[PDB]
């Protein structure tokens, strides 16, 4: 039978992205189901082995998947990962694209902390979106994990903490729907952009869609133009209309950070923690699903 790493039987394809396809796998040693990421060794610029190095640097952190195997086999670079549960996009769709305020805030607390942890390891993620957060399995079903480090990169030197330099004239990196305003302006990404994207993810959960989503265009180059224009023409206060002011406060805070500024991860958590209490919610791990 076909087994990557001589050990993981290949199952059905479960996803595809710019940096490889994802398949179900089964560890013949334990029967443990796993996720197998494959990248063609002929790829323009190989990326999976670098992604694997990032995962290894983050191991042990709360909500970081464990990497089981990395190697080259046949026409593929291989990365075998612990299998997690459904993504937040999967669960959002399962829940008919409605999340309660309580679920949004339960998620927001952990997602801010996941992003802070990555930053604490000197990296920015650069692709914050609902598909890239997965709940844990079984007992760990209460824990939000972050995945997909294919666009991640160091933003400061590990020893000196010298921040990467500012620059403009960059092409869009990440996803158009969730990218920060400064990313659309061609500015180098930094810590603030991961958190701004999260702010759009949270308002997406509240609304079911974002106002720049589903725009009619022609080229994908002009697709980005219509998205950038709508995102810039929609004030944060209009975006967040009908929802607690904390969501606009969060987004305004992120937009006001300077390029190399350390975000106040505690302030942002307390905004939505204070709201959680005002609402009368308890942190009892009861999500909409």
């Amino acid at each position: 039978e076909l087994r990557v790493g001589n050990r993981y039987r290949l199952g059905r394809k479960i996803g595809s992205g710019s940096f490889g396809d994802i398949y179900l796998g089964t560890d013949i040693a334990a029967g443990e189901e796993v996720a197998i990421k494959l990248e063609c060794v002929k790829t323009k610029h190989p990326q999976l082995h670098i992604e694997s190095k990032i995962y290894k640097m983050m191991q042990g952190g709360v909500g970081i998947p464990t990497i089981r195997w990395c190697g080259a086999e046949g026409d593929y670079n291989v990365m075998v990962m612990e299998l997690l549960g459904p993504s937040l996009e999967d669960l959002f769709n399962f829940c008919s694209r409605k999340f309660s305020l309580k679920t949004v805030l339960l998620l927001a607390d952990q997602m801010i902390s996941r992003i802070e942890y990555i930053h604490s390891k000197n990296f920015i993620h650069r692709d914050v979106k609902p598909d890239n957060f997965l709940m844990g399995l079984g007992k760990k079903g209460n824990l939000v994990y972050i995945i997909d480090f294919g666009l991640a990169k160091k933003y400061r030197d590990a020893r000196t903490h010298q921040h990467i330099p500012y620059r403009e004239n960059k092409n869009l990196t990440g996803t158009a729907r969730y990218a920060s305003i400064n990313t659309h302006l061609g500015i180098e990404q930094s810590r603030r952009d991961d958190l701004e994207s999260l702010g759009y993810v949270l308002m997406y959960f509240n609304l079911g869609s974002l106002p720049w989503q589903g725009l009619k265009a022609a080229t994908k180059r002009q697709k980005y133009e219509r998205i950038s224009e709508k995102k810039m023409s929609t004030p944060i206060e209009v975006l967040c209309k009908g929802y607690p002011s904390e969501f606009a406060t969060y987004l305004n805070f992120c937009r006001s950070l300077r390029f190399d500024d350390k975000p106040d991860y505690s302030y942002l958590r307390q905004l939505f923690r204070n709201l959680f209490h005002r609402q009368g919610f308890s942190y009892d791990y009861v999500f909409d699903w």
Binding site: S18, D127, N171, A176
Partner: peptide, 7 residues
């Protein structure tokens, strides 16, 4: 609009 884009 949801594709992962690189630099």
């Amino acid at each position: 609009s949801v594709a992962s884009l690189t630099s």
